[PDB]
Amino acid sequence: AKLHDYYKDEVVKKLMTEFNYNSVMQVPRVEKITLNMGVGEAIADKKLLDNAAADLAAISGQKPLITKARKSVAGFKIRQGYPIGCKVTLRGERMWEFFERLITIAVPRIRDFRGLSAKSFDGRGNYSMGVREQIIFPEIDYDKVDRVRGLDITITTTAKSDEEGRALLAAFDFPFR
């Protein structure tokens, strides 16, 4: 709960005056971090999806949730209901203990780091970015690697606009190119 403690004491009162909020409840928060791993090719073989989810299980310590196809589409030749990918949502301190684990360990590892973008916001104050490599995390060892599949990470915030959204993660020293 490092940045969690760092949240309630430091980033609140700088933001409280930055936007001149009347109540502390107006400051944005961070609800959940959900990691998505769209396998897509597991239809060929499903032995690779379990170990694919085994990786995502090691990144966050949570057993993943296998997502199914919402509807049949032949453009990627899948019928509705096929195991298509896994996901994990993180809340509470498990989100925090992961939220510092990348910003202080997930940031200084990506190949040819150039910094995150400031335009990748939903438009209502929620950020999302995708990492291409899975060997960027300390948990997953390089020795045990059957594939180089990435994953998406989206940040759900109670912010109302992107300005309030970018201001919050900037307070956590987020790399903004």
Partner: protein, 114 residues
């Protein structure tokens, strides 16, 4: 292990293992091992972590990594946007350095098509 050049070199003779970095050949690998103080015939295993930190400190002096890829892309892009002769040869995938195009341009032209 791993180097400031993200890439993970194999566990083999240090002089050849350091070549896996993009931008480090044999000469630069020998120079890195000489300026660091590590022998060339020792494997990447049997190397202390303090010695790998030393190798990182020396490879940090070179522009050898996606950074170098960026500088090469920038130069080729400058050539192409300038519209000079080499820029046009880069635009069309034809040999740039005066080689004959009547025959033998298969590296730049790729597999032949009738």
């Amino acid at each position: 292990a791993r180097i400031a050049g993200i890439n993970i070199p194999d566990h083999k003779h240090a002089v050849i293992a350091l070549t896996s970095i993009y931008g480090v050949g044999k000469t630069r690998s020998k120079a890195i091992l000489a300026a660091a103080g590590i022998a060339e015939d020792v494997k990447i295993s049997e190397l202390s972590e303090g010695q790998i930190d030393t190798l990182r400190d020396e490879v940090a002096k070179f522009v050898v990594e996606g950074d170098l890829r960026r500088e090469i892309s920038m130069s080729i892009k400058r050539l192409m946007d300038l519209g000079c002769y080499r820029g046009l040869r880069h635009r069309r995938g034809l040999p740039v350095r005066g080689q004959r195009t009547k025959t033998n341009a298969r590296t730049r032209k790729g597999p032949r098509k009738p």
